[PDB]
Amino acid sequence: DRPRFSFSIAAREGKARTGTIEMKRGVIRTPAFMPVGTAATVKALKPETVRATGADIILGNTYHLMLRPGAERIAKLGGLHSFMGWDRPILTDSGGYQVMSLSSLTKQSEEGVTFKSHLSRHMLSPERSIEIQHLLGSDIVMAFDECTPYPATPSRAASSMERSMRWAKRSRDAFDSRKEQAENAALFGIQQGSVFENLRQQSADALAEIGFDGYAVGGLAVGEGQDEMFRVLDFSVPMLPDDKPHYLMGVGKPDDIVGAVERGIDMFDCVLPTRSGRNGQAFTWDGPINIRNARFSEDLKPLDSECHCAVCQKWSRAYIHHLIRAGEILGAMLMTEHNIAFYQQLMQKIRDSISEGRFSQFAQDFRARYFA
Amino acid sequence: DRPRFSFSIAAREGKARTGTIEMKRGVIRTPAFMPVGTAATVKALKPETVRATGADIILGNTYHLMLRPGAERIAKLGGLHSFMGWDRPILTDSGGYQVMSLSSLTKQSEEGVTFKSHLSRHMLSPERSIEIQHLLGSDIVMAFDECTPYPATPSRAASSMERSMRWAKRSRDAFDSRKEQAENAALFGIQQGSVFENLRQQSADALAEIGFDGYAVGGLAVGEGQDEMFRVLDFSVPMLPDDKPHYLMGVGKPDDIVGAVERGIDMFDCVLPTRSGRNGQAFTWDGPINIRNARFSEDLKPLDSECHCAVCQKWSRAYIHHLIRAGEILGAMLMTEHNIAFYQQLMQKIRDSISEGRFSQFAQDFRARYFA
Ligand SMILES: CCOC(=O)Nc1nc2cc3nc(NC)[nH]c3cc2c(=O)[nH]1
Ligand SMILES: CCOC(=O)Nc1nc2cc3nc(NC)[nH]c3cc2c(=O)[nH]1
Ligand SMILES: [Cl-]
Ligand SMILES: [Cl-]
Numbered sequence A, B: 001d002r003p004r005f006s007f008s009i010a011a012r013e014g015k016a017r018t019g020t021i022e023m024k025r026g027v028i029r030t031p032a033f034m035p036v037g038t039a040a041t042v043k044a045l046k047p048e049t050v051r052a053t054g055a056d057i058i059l060g061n062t063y064h065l066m067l068r069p070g071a072e073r074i075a076k077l078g079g080l081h082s083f084m085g086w087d088r089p090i091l092t093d094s095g096g097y098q099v100m101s102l103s104s105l106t107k108q109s110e111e112g113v114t115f116k117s118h119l120s121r122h123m124l125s126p127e128r129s130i131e132i133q134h135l136l137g138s139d140i141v142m143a144f145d146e147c148t149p150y151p152a153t154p155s156r157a158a159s160s161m162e163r164s165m166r167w168a169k170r171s172r173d174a175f176d177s178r179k180e181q182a183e184n185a186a187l188f189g190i191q192q193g194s195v196f197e198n199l200r201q202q203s204a205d206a207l208a209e210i211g212f213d214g215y216a217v218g219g220l221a222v223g224e225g226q227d228e229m230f231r232v233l234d235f236s237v238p239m240l241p242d243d244k245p246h247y248l249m250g251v252g253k254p255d256d257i258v259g260a261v262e263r264g265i266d267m268f269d270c271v272l273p274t275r276s277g278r279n280g281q282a283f284t285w286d287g288p289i290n291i292r293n294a295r296f297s298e299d300l301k302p303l304d305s306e307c308h309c310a311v312c313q314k315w316s317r318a319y320i321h322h323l324i325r326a327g328e329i330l331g332a333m334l335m336t337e338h339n340i341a342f343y344q345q346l347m348q349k350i351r352d353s354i355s356e357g358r359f360s361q362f363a364q365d366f367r368a369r370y371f372a
């Protein structure tokens, strides 16, 4: 039987790595892209379709699930895996980011965050976050953190990061005090420190002293732009333990993913393929297209000329254009399946190119064609 | 190779019949239920899923397709079958009903109907209707008719029926003058006459003199109620040729279908399973349920206890309740697949019970449990 958690690096090129995470519920090929399951569904896809695209693991939003249908309710029904019908690994976020971005009213303190839902008063703390993630039956549990707004002054970035590190220790202890969770799940810590190298180093040191199964680079993709995100990754990823997975949450566009892998990132999640698919944006190897545009009304070609997904095997741009213009559910279904499949094909090409020692060339060829 | 059209009756019980329609694109088992493809999609289902539920044939709405994406455009793209990815028979309606129920402004005359779309001025006539259905590549073409509003005075019902019969002859001649359509498709005529036996007889006689591949009972399910619909069917169906299919369009609830089969109907279509599925109504052998209701929030049972569909094999009422409450696309997908599968299972039980000479008992047992 598979272990609780084992990360193994099979090949490397520069800072990029390819390998596997073995967990009780399955193997995760890295670098990995996680489709986002907001409220117990990857929007517009059955779980079998998510798997057919190549996904090994999905993400669930703790903030949404604790509000609807409720964490205790999901536990009573047998956990998130059986509730939604996905039997493979699930990573749950902590709630610490969405509580601040999505709540109408919040009160922050050293204890945690109290908030009002957009749909009653609610509470999130390191302890409650770890508990909710346990009730959901999460395989990869995220420490409860604070995502510092950008831009941040050095003082505010430091104060925020320091609180996040105290919360990381509380998250570790809560997780370890629940025997079933400690034996069957993994716990990742989240580095903070905004764009400041010294704070990033202090955060990495604090997380490594506590000890986690994996390490995320938090606090990025919050308005700083790709140049600055890459500059921060340049010095931040090498601070993390080499032998554990490196996770960049909330990223991103295809070129963001490629450059982040070049900088040592092993795991990603983003709503872009699902949300923008529903809005009519399709990813192709020649860049994104907006299927709503009139130029596609009689285009018999598939969304992408090389894509192997079931949507591209069968339906035309012209048909999907009609569905999206008409507001048809099938339009959302087909666009989402293709976009998630495209993202998985990107990850497969990244993995294979690292394994063959030609990732640098792949990245160059990818960028030249995608931005032509 | 299959013929253009062959209807064969394999077994009978009272007025009920079971058999097959063979056409170039496939075999249709009768009595048959046709899921409705409004604008080139059975809403929220891939065509493979429609087929997996047991459907042999789907319906397409001429009124919608001529407005978006357009009949000539669909023809240029290769026809409706390849456009939407359904390779089996498609029955198209004539447009004569939806033009009057859905248009914002209409002008009726002996030539046809001019109208304004809810999304420009447009025109429908017997000739244009048959042409549109040809451009779509329809397998079963419907004569262009007028559905008399209910209630109707004898004078107005007679005038409307007489116009419909003149339009039936024009539909026949238009269809026959297009060699490719006449050789590969079938044409059904539509009986009118409101609730009046003498007008129904005159209409049946006119249609039989013209000659069609099948005959529909038009002008029902327009507010008269089940008792009156059944009373009209009692005398109307025996007026039609016994050796051709009998089609009751726009019907209906499960009990409407059972009683209509008891009265000699072989074919049905209705938006009820799809539309009401998206709205949270699920059909069960114990009657419909509203999955939005709070009583289902922790119900681990499938939608129906006996249903063999993929939704009932995997997901709980509690999960689907959550999806529908949340407005999730997957909720619409799962409810629709189950409801269409339920309707197909109803048709299968009807067919099998007629074949075994126990349809009367099935109808009694069905009604006792469904309305308990
Ligand atoms: C995935 C687990 O993350 C957490 O528990 N906290 C967290 N979430 C983030 C989500 C983000 N999304 C974006 N951009 C779209 N940037 C993000 C940063 C964080 C973060 O610092 N911390
Ligand atoms: C299916 C082909 O029908 C036509 O071309 N004309 C037509 N359509 C109808 C649709 C109806 N839907 C309902 N109730 C929901 N009743 C209907 C009657 C007709 C009709 O008389 N004539
Ligand atoms: Cl995101
Ligand atoms: Cl209907």
Ligand SMILES: [Zn+2]
Pocket: A303, A304, A307, A308, A309, A310, A311, A312, A313, A338, A339, A341, A342
């Ligand atoms: Zn594709």
Ligand SMILES: [Zn+2]
Pocket: B303, B304, B307, B308, B309, B310, B311, B312, B313, B338, B339, B341, B342
């Ligand atoms: Zn079912």
